[PDB]
Amino acid sequence: HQPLIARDGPHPVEQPVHNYMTKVIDRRALNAAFSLATEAIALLTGEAL
Amino acid sequence: DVEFDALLGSYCNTLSLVRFLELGLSVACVCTKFPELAYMNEGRVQFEV
Structure with a gap:
């Protein structure tokens, strides 16, 4: 809401102004990886018991 | 519309298991289990004389 200064003279009379707006968020999903393969895949889980 | 008697003596012997x-x-072999040889990725038996 912007303010204003009351001003004397042949100046145009000042009217309060109000600024209404909206943004939007961004996304940018972040990725990390992994790898496990074969032998150590079935080493972990029942299969070695 | 038939009838089935079953022989008491002399059983049939399907699939003898060796x-x-x-x-x-x-005699020629000595057997041991190396239940990690699925994932062994190369093995050697080393006996030293």
Whole structure:
């Protein structure tokens, strides 16, 4: 809401102004990886018991 | 519309099961389990004389 200064003279009379707006968020999903393969895949889980 | 008697003596013997021990042929090998040889990725038996 912007303010204003009351001003004397042949100046145009000042009217309060109000600024209404909206943004939007961004996304940018972040990725990390992994790898496990074969032998150590079935080493972990029942299969070695 | 028939009838089935079953012989008491003289059973049929379907699928005799041979065990690998009790053969004549197993003298030649000594067997051990290396239940990690699925994932062994190369093995060597080293006996030193």
